[PDB]
C-alpha cells in the first residue's frame, strides 16, 4: 500500500493496526519506494519508517527520517517502557553517531538533531528517567535547553571536563546566564561564602603561576576589602605564608597608588596654598574632603586638618578627619590606632561633633575587621548610645561593617535597634532607611522577617515601607521585585527603589514599566521617578538620560531639577561630551536663588571627568576661569565659595579611578545611601553626603 | 483621551500657519507670519521645542499667534528631483569588457555599506567617492556603470552645468541644497557627470560671471572638501574632458579613485553587439565580424542605434526578424550619418 501510485492517505499510524505481522517484513520492501525518484509517497513512507527504524533502535536514521516529519516524532508509540528504552538506546546511540571523525565536525541549532532531542526531550523531562544525551553528547546549544525552570543557586555545578571544554562551556554558560538574575560573577556578591568559590577561584588559574599574573595580581591589588584576599588567601596555595606579601592590600594599594601617580596627577602647592591665603571659607562644608583624597598621605596638612577641626566648627571636621585616616590608609593600614581616639575623646552629643571621627574609622576601614576593627567599632559605639542616639550617627555606623562583610556574624543591627524607642517618625525615615539596610546584604530571607516582627510589632506605619525595601534589597534582581511592586502604595517609594534595585540586568527591558509608572503614577511621584536612573543606566546613559531629564532640567521645580541633575549625576559622569559642556551655558545664567542652581550647574561640572588629570591630562586653567568668573556673582552668597571647591572635590581629588565604581559589578554603598537623604535636602544632610 | 478633547478647543477650530523666526530662552519664540508679525509664544505643548529651529513651520492659533504644534511639510522641488526611482533594469552584467575597469569602482561603492567586514576591520575607509571620464561622447556609457549602482542603496543624479549657472546666483546654494539634503537622506550617492561649468560659455538669461561660476565650483569643492561634513552621500563624478577640470578638486576628492574609460576592442565590440542583439531576432545570414571590423571605435549605443534602425526598416517591411542586407544598409544610414556630419 505504501508504494501505491495513488497519493491517498494515510501511511501514518497504520503500522499500529497490523504491527507484529509487518514485522515479518523489513526495510527491504521500503527502499525501492523511497530511493526511486518520480514515485508516490516518498517522505510519507518515512512516517511508517521512523517507527520501524525507531523500534529497531537505529540512530541518525530516525533522525534522517524525521527531517521532513517534524511532527509525529513527538507523539509516537503508550507504555513508557519502550519509550525510555529506545529513548536511552537511541540516546546513547545517537551521540555515538556524532563526533565520529573525531574532534567535531560538530552537528550538523538545527531542526533535525536539536529539534528532535528537544522534541523527545520533552517526554524525557516530563516524568521518567533523567540525564539524556545532553550529558552524553556535549552540545551547549541543547544544554541551553537541557535545563528546566528551577532555582539556579544550586546550578553553579557541572561535570568537570577538560579546561578546553571548560572554557567554551563557561562562555556559552555565561551568555546563557546573563539574562538570568544570577551570573558567574556571583562569586563577588554571594554569600555563598563557602570555601568552594575560592577554591575553584584560585584553581581557574591553577596551576600556572606565571601567566597567572592577570586575574590574580590585579585581583589582589584591585581589592579594597579583605574578604576575597582572605578566603582566597586560604585558597591561594602558591608558595607558603609569603603570598601574604601580595595580600593585605599594603603593597597592593602602594603599587597601584604609585602607578596612579604614574598616570596622574593633582596639583598640590599652587591651588591649596593660594587657597590657604584665603583662610577659612564660609561653607565649612566641602573643603575637608579635598585634603582627604588629595593627600594621601602627607602628615603636614594632616595636623592642619586636625588642629583646625579641634575648633569643632559645624561638621567641617568631616572631610578633614576623613583625610586623617584616608591619608595613611591610602596604602595601609592605617591610622586606625589614632583614627577612633577622637570618637570617645569628643557624649557626642551629635554626629557633627564626636560622630564625624566615629564615621572615620568605620568608612576608612575598607577591609577591616582584620579582625580588630570590627569589635573595636562595635565596642566604641556600644560606649555612646543615648548620646548617639538612634538618629544622626546610626545613619553612618553600619557602613563600617556591611561594606567589609555581608555575611558577618556580628549583629550590630540588634544592638543599634534597641534604641528605636524614641518613636519619632521623621528622622527615622533617612535614619532607619540605610540604618537597617546598611548592616548586611544577608540573603537568608530570615533577617528582614526578624527585624520586621521585632521592629514593627505592630508596625511603624512608616518604616515598614523601607523595611520591605530592605527585604527587596536583601535578595538581588531575583525578579521577585516586579512581584513586590503590586502593593504600589500611595507612599509609592516601594516602586521607585523596587524598580531601581529590583532589576540588575544588562538589557534594560525596564523602559516599559519605568515609563509606565510615571505615566500611570500619582502626582509628585514623578519627582521620585528619575532617581531610578542610577542602576539600569550603567549601560547606555547618553541617549536616554539627557533626553528625558533634558526636559526635566528647565522645569521650574527645584525638586525635579535637583533630583534630575542627580538622576544624571554620577552615572552621567562616566564620560563627557560637547553637549554637556555646551549645555552648562545658561544653566548658570538663571536668576534663581537657592543651592539648587549651583548644584545643577556645579554638579553638572563634575560630569566632565572624574579623577582624571591634571598634568596629564586636561588643563586645570579652564576650570579655574569658569569657577573664577561664575563666582563674581552675589557676591557672597557663600554658596559660590562652596561650589568652587565642589567641582574640585572630584576634580582635584583624583588618586582613584572609577571605573565605575565598579567594573567588577559591585556597587558603591555610600553613594546610594547618601544620595537618598538630600532628596529633601535641608541643613547638614548635604554635608553628610559631602563625606564623598 | 481628555487631552485630545482639550487642546483642540484652544487650537481650534482655525489656526494660522506661521514661521518661526527666532527663539528666546523664555520659551517665548519670536515668530513671523504674513506680514511682519512678530510675537512671544510660551507653550509647553507638542514640543519638541528643541528640534523646531528657526525657518520652519510652526502652527499659530489665532488667539493669539499661539503655537499648538509644528508641521514639517515637504515636497520641495529638490526632493522631487531625487527619486523615482528607477531601480533600473540595467545591471553591470548587461555591459561587458570593462570588468577590470568596473571591478574597482564596484568595490568602492559596495566596499562600504554592503559587505563592510573587510572594509571596517581593515581601518582604511576611503568613502570619498570616485571620478570617471572617457571619450569621445561616453560617460553615460559610465551611467551603464552607475545604472548598476542605482540598483542598490540610495541615489540622486545631478548632472550638467545647466543646473548651476542658469540664472543669477545665489552661486552654489542649489549645490548647498543638494549636499545637505543628500546628507539628510544619508546613506546616499550623488552622481555628477559632464561638468561643463568651465566648458560652457554663454550665461543663461542675464547672468555673471565666469569667475562666479569658478567660485561656485570652488564652493562645490569646499562643501565636498569639506569643513566639516562626514556625511555620505558618496559622490561619483564623470565627464568627457578632464583637461578643463581644475586640480583643486582632486586632492580633497576624489584623491584616491578615478577611472579611465577605454574604447572597446574586437571581443568587447562583438560582446556588446551580442548584448543588444540578444533580444532582437536576426536573419541567419547576419554576421558580426564584418560589422566590428568595418566600424571604428564605436561604443554600445552606436551599434545599439544601428540595431534600432535595423528594426526600424524591419518594421517598414513589417518583419519581426531583421535581414543582414537591411542591417548593412540600415547600418549605412548611421555609417553615412557619421560620415555626413
Amino acid at each position: 500500500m505504501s508504494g501505491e501510485v495513488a497519493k491517498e492517505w494515510q501511511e501514518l499510524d497504520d503500522a499500529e493496526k497490523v504491527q507484529r505481522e509487518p514485522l515479518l517484513t523489513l526495510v527491504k520492501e521500503i527502499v525501492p519506494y523511497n530511493m526511486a525518484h518520480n514515485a508516490e509517497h516518498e517522505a510519507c513512507d518515512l512516517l511508517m519508517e521512523i517507527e520501524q527504524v525507531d523500534m529497531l533502535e537505529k540512530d541518525i536514521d530516525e533522525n534522517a527520517y524525521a527531517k521532513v516529519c517534524l511532527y509525529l516524532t513527538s507523539c509516537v508509540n503508550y507504555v513508557p517502557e519502550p519509550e525510555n528504552s529506545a529513548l536511552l538506546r537511541c540516546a546513547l546511540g545517537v551521540f555515538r553517531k556524532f563526533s565520529r571523525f573525531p574532534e567535531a565536525l560538530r552537528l550538523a541549532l538545527m531542526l533535525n538533531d536539536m529539534e528532535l532531542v528537544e522534541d523527545i526531550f520533552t517526554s524525557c523531562k516530563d516524568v521518567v528517567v533523567q540525564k539524556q544525551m545532553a550529558f552524553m553528547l556535549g552540545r551547549h546549544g541543547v544544554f541551553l535547553e537541557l535545563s528546566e525552570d528551577v532555582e539556579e543557586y544550586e546550578d553553579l555545578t557541572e561535570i568537570m571536563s577538560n579546561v578546553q571544554l571548560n572554557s567554551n562551556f563557561l562562555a556559552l554558560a555565561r551568555e546563557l546566564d546573563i539574562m538570568e538574575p544570577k551570573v558567574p560573577d556571583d562569586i563577588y556578591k554571594t554569600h555563598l561564602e563557602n570555601n568552594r568559590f575560592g577554591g575553584s577561584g584560585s584553581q581557574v588559574d591553577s596551576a600556572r603561576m606565571n601567566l597567572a599574573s592577570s586575574f590574580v595580581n590585579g585581583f589582589v591589588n584591585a581589592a579594597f576589602g579583605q574578604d576575597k584576599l582572605l578566603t582566597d588567601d586560604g585558597n591561594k596555595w602558591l608558595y607558603k605564608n609569603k603570598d601574604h606579601g601580595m595580600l593585605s592590600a599594603a603593597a597592593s594599594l602602594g603599587m597601584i597608588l604609585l602607578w596612579d601617580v604614574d598616570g596622574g596627577l593633582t596639583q598640590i602647592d599652587k591651588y591649596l596654598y593660594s587657597s590657604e591665603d584665603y583662610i577659612k571659607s564660609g561653607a565649612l562644608l566641602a573643603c575637608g574632603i579635598v585634603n582627604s583624597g588629595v593627600r594621601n598621605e602627607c602628615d603636614p596638612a594632616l595636623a592642619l586638618l586636625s588642629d583646625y577641626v579641634l575648633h569643632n566648627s559645624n561638621t567641617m571636621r568631616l572631610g578633614s578627619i576623613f583625610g586623617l585616616g584616608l591619608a595613611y590608609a591610602g596604602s595601609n593600614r592605617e591610622d586606625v590606632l589614632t583614627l577612633l581616639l577622637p570618637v570617645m575623646g569628643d557624649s557626642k552629643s551629635s554626629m557633627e561633633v564626636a560622630g564625624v571621627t566615629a564615621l572615620a574609622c568605620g568608612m576608612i576601614a575598607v577591609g577591616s575587621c582584620n579582625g580588630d576593627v570590627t569589635s573595636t567599632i562595635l565596642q566604641t559605639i556600644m560606649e555612646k548610645s543615648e548620646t548617639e542616639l538612634k538618629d544622626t550617627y546610626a545613619r553612618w555606623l553600619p557602613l563600617g561593617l556591611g561594606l567589609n562583610h555581608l555575611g558577618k556574624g556580628e549583629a550590630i543591627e540588634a544592638i543599634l535597634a534597641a534604641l528605636e524607642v524614641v518613636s519619632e517618625p521623621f528622622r527615622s525615615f533617612a535614619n532607619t532607611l540605610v540604618d537597617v539596610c546598611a548592616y548586611a546584604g544577608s540573603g537568608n530571607v530570615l533577617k528582614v522577617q526578624q527585624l520586621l516582627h521585632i521592629c514593627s510589632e505592630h508596625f511603624d506605619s512608616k518604616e515598614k515601607e523601607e523595611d520591605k525595601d530592605k527585604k527587596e534589597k536583601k535578595d538581588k534582581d531575583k525578579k521577585e521585585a516586579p512581584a513586590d511592586m503590586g502593593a504600589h502604595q500611595g507612599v509609592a517609594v516601594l516602586g521607585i527603589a523596587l524598580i531601581a534595585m529590583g532589576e540588575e540586568i544588562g538589557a534594560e527591558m525596564a523602559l516599559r514599566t519605568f515609563g509606565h509608572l510615571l505615566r500611570y503614577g500619582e502626582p509628585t511621584l514623578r519627582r521620585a521617578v528619575p532617581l531610578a536612573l542610577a542602576l539600569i543606566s550603567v549601560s547606555n546613559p547618553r541617549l536616554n538620560i539627557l533626553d528625558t531629564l533634558s526636559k526635566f532640567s528647565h522645569d521650574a521645580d527645584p525638586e525635579v531639577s535637583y533630583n534630575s541633575i542627580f538622576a544624571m549625576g554620577m552615572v552621567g559622569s562616566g564620560t563627557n561630551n560637547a553637549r554637556l559642556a555646551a549645555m552648562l551655558r545658561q544653566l548658570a545664567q538663571y536668576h534663581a536663588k537657592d543651592p539648587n542652581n549651583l548644584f545643577m550647574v556645579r554638579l553638572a561640572q563634575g560630569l566632565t571627568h572624574l579623577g582624571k588629570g591634571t598634568l596629564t591630562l586636561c588643563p586645570y586653567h579652564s576650570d579655574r576661569q569658569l569657577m573664577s568668573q561664575v563666582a563674581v556673582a552675589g557676591l557672597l552668597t557663600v554658596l559660590v565659595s562652596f561650589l568652587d571647591v565642589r567641582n574640585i572635590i572630584l576634580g582635584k581629588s583624583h588618586y582613584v579611578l572609577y571605573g565605575l565604581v565598579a567594573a567588577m559589578q559591585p556597587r558603591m554603598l555610600v553613594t546610594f545611601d547618601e544620595e537618598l537623604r538630600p532628596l529633601p535636602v535641608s541643613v547638614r544632610v548635604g554635608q553628610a553626603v559631602d563625606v564623598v | 483621551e481628555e487631552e485630545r478633547s482639550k487642546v483642540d478647543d484652544l487650537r481650534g477650530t482655525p489656526m494660522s500657519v506661521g514661521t518661526l523666526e527666532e527663539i528666546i530662552d523664555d520659551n517665548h519664540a519670536i515668530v513671523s507670519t504674513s506680514v511682519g508679525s512678530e510675537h512671544y509664544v510660551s507653550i509647553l505643548s507638542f514640543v519638541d521645542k528643541d528640534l523646531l529651529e528657526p525657518g520652519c513651520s510652526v502652527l499659530l492659533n489665532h488667539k493669539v499667534h499661539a503655537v499648538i504644534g509644528v508641521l514639517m511639510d515637504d515636497t520641495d522641488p529638490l526632493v522631487t528631483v531625487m527619486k523615482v526611482e528607477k531601480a533600473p533594469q540595467e545591471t553591470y552584467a548587461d555591459i561587458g569588457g570593462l570588468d577590470n575597469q568596473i571591478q574597482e569602482i564596484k568595490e568602492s561603492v559596495e566596499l562600504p555599506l554592503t559587505h563592510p567586514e573587510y572594509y571596517e576591520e581593515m581601518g582604511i575607509k576611503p568613502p570619498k567617492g570616485v571620478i570617471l571620464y572617457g571619450p569621445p561622447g561616453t560617460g553615460k556609457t559610465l551611467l551603464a556603470k552607475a545604472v548598476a549602482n542605482q540598483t542598490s542603496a540610495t541615489f540622486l543624479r545631478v548632472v550638467g552645468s545647466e543646473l548651476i549657472q542658469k540664472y543669477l546666483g545665489d552661486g552654489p546654494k542649489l549645490v548647498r541644497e543638494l549636499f545637505r539634503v543628500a546628507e539628510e537622506h544619508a546613506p546616499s550617492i550623488v552622481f555628477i557627470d559632464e561638468i561643463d561649468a568651465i566648458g560652457t560659455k554663454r550665461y543663461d538669461s542675464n547672468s555673471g560671471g565666469e569667475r562666479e561660476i569658478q567660485r561656485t565650483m570652488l564652493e562645490l569643492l569646499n562643501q565636498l572638501d569639506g569643513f566639516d561634513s562626514r556625511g555620505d552621500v558618496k559622490v561619483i563624478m564623470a565627464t568627457n574632458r578632464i583637461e578643463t577640470l581644475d586640480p583643486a578638486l582632486i586632492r580633497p576628492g576624489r584623491i584616491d579613485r578615478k577611472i579611465e574609460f577605454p574604447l572597446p576592442d574586437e571581443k568587447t565590440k562583438k560582446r556588446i553587439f551580442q548584448i543588444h542583439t540578444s533580444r532582437m531576432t536576426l536573419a541567419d545570414d547576419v554576421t558580426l565580424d564584418d560589422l566590428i571590423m568595418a566600424k571604428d571605435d564605436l561604443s554600445g549605443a552606436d551599434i545599439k542605434a544601428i540595431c534600432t534602425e535595423a528594426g526600424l526598416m524591419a518594421l517598414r517591411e513589417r518583419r519581426m526578424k531583421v535581414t543582414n542586407e537591411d542591417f548593412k544598409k540600415s547600418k549605412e544610414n548611421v555609417l553615412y550619418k557619421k560620415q555626413e556630419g
Binding site: G515, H516, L518, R519, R526, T548, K551 | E3, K6, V7, L10, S42, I43, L44, S45, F46, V47
Partner: peptide, 15 residues
C-alpha cells in the same frame, strides 16, 4: 506617549 501626556497636561497653567 507618557511624555506627550505630561506635555499636553501643562496647558492648563499655560492658558
Amino acid at each position: 506617549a507618557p511624555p506627550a501626556l505630561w506635555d499636553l497636561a501643562a496647558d492648563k497653567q499655560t492658558l
